[PDB]
Amino acid sequence: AYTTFSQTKNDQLKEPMFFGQPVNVARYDQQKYDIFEKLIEKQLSFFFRPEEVDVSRDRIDYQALPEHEKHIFISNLKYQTLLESIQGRSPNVALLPLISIPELETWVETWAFSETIHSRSYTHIIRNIVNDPSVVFDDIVTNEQIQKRAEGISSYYDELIEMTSYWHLLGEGTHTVNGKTVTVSLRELKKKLYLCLMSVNALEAIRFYVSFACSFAFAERELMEGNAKIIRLIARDEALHLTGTQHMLNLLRSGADDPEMAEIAEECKQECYDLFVQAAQQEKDWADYLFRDGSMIGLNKDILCQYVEYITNIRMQAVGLDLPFNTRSNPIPWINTWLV
Amino acid sequence: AYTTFSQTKNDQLKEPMFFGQPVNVARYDQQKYDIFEKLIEKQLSFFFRPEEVDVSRDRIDYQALPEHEKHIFISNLKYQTLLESIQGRSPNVALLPLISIPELETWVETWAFSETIHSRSYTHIIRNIVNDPSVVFDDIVTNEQIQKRAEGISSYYDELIEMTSYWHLLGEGTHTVNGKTVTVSLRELKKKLYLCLMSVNALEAIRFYVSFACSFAFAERELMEGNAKIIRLIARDEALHLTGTQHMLNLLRSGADDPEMAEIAEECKQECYDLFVQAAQQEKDWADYLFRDGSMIGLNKDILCQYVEYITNIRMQAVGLDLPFNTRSNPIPWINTWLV
Ligand SMILES: [Fe+3]
Ligand SMILES: [Fe+3]
Ligand SMILES: [Fe+3]
Ligand SMILES: [Fe+3]
Ligand SMILES: [Hg+2]
Ligand SMILES: [Hg+2]
Ligand SMILES: [Hg+2]
Ligand SMILES: [Hg+2]
Ligand SMILES: [Hg+2]
Ligand SMILES: [Hg+2]
Ligand SMILES: [Hg+2]
Ligand SMILES: [Hg+2]
Ligand SMILES: [Hg+2]
Numbered sequence A, B: 001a002y003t004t005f006s007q008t009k010n011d012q013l014k015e016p017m018f019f020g021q022p023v024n025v026a027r028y029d030q031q032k033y034d035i036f037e038k039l040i041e042k043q044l045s046f047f048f049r050p051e052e053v054d055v056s057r058d059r060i061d062y063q064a065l066p067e068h069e070k071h072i073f074i075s076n077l078k079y080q081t082l083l084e085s086i087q088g089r090s091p092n093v094a095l096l097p098l099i100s101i102p103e104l105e106t107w108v109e110t111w112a113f114s115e116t117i118h119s120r121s122y123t124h125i126i127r128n129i130v131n132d133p134s135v136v137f138d139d140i141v142t143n144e145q146i147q148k149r150a151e152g153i154s155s156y157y158d159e160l161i162e163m164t165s166y167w168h169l170l171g172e173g174t175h176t177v178n179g180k181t182v183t184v185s186l187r188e189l190k191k192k193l194y195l196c197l198m199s200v201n202a203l204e205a206i207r208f209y210v211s212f213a214c215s216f217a218f219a220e221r222e223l224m225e226g227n228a229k230i231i232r233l234i235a236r237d238e239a240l241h242l243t244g245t246q247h248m249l250n251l252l253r254s255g256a257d258d259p260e261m262a263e264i265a266e267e268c269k270q271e272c273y274d275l276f277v278q279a280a281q282q283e284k285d286w287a288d289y290l291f292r293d294g295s296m297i298g299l300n301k302d303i304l305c306q307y308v309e310y311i312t313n314i315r316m317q318a319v320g321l322d323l324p325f326n327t328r329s330n331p332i333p334w335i336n337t338w339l340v
Helices: A034-045 A056-064 A067-098 A102-129 A133-141 A144-150 A153-170 A186-219 A225-254 A259-290 A301-318 B034-045 B058-064 B067-098 B102-129 B133-142 B149-170 B186-220 B225-254 B259-267 B269-290 B301-318 B333-337
Strands: A173-177 A180-184 B173-177 B180-184
Touching (some): A067 A133, A067 A144, A067 B067, A102 B102, A180 A186, A186 A259, A259 A301, B034 B102, B034 B225, B067 B269, B149 B180, B149 B186, B186 B301, B225 B259, B259 B269, B269 B301
Antiparallel strands (some): B173 B180
């Protein structure tokens, strides 16, 4: 029941962000929420060409790196590459079919597009510091540790997409598909979308930042200069992306958009909380692997765990959630030099 | 079912363009078909920002225009805006769930992204030539003369999308849904895809170009020059987009990518031929509504119909279809000044 061009002349200013009439005309002279138009404008002004960044010095740096540091660096890079691969396609496949206002539709496509630029950035880096990129890329798919930390991301998107297909094909109600009873509840689908957004928020605001810290730790040593330049550019984008998800979530929570979503945000609160607690634990567990062959001065399991708790509290507070971790000061204030 | 990250390590160089294993890792150091990587590179280098183009004098030119000429210019602009609205979202929603090689996946997202920039460009133009852009945007959805091609175009996409969901949800076979038998055939799905693709190729290769002539005719008279500058940039992008669909179609019919597709394409060639002629006829019929109150310097019903036939012959031959019109040289050579 999805359509690429709904023929009903509708007031796009009055549609809810999600689940309303599919967006027909793409206009940018007005919007229900100007924050999304502002985000589009900003992201477009941040467009960069990865391959333009000189990374020839990085090959020398990397090869000369102690084996355990090469492991730390490359393992971190492979994870970032994984996340970007997922983020380049997922926002589009999972959200586009459900958006009902033009500024949000285009913001999602712009956001997703910038993620593919980040992916291209990592190919540029990988291809220039390693001898055979295929070993790195292939390991991304395998490697239980990397998939372990990322566990739950693709699965959630997949479940939302599947439920969305059922909704578009069958509509609300209880159906019989190949002799099985299938229930399609719009309310449940909204919950799925809401929790998917919370998870994306955790991904954009926590998982990417924990990785940036590992990357910049080398930059602090005056190593991997090119990578550092690229990561700074990528981080600039992720800041816009999480600004976007925080706004989506807080606008839904406010009751100014779909009233049912405000009810859901309230009922889902514990699940929201749990999602962050789980994500944080995954980032922490990754330390055992990352530092399996040894750690670095200023970068080890304890420091990583403290940073994960530090940032998780900040991100959770931003979307109105209680803080699970004890409050603490930034364990790595040197990271600010590289961020925003 | 569809997944945002297939956990199976696969050789992406050996997957078919479509219907293979969903793309997991986004890598750009290698590709099965380098044409797609080259197109991504070219499209990225062509990025531009509409807002930077001076269109302040277009408002005055538009007002001074004879009423029938205002009609021609604005009707054309509205149709271009409609097409970009569809093209900004559709390639992503319709093709992403079916692509199995990374270079094509990212090319589609880059292609779609550039179309959203074109949409933003049209907003920029509209806002600078009329009082209250709302009048213009609303007419796009309801304008009868325009909402004929939209229906036909959106129909191909919508049907492909629906069949794709059934395929991902139920797989091949004879199924039952609420008392009705539902047959899902991969062969039919491949045919449906071959159909959006041919239709999108005609959209990119013929529909857009006919509107460009409509638009550059003013530029030749030194009118609506801001619009012209923007259309020149848009046309530069469409050339890349049609190159991409031409390669996709030719790789599918040759049989080098997927034997079954070559088989299917050969079977439905008469259909594709009629599909193309119908698109050409729709563009011709539009000339009527366009010049219902009079023609202008260098552009009339006859010249336009000649151009449509000229362009259609070229595009159809490019994808292996018989020529439907009598051969002739470019009826409007002057357009070459504005086209890639
Ligand atoms: Fe990113
Ligand atoms: Fe992001
Ligand atoms: Fe376009
Ligand atoms: Fe195009
Ligand atoms: Hg999600
Ligand atoms: Hg770290
Ligand atoms: Hg909930
Ligand atoms: Hg919540
Ligand atoms: Hg800790
Ligand atoms: Hg199509
Ligand atoms: Hg024309
Ligand atoms: Hg065909
Ligand atoms: Hg065709």
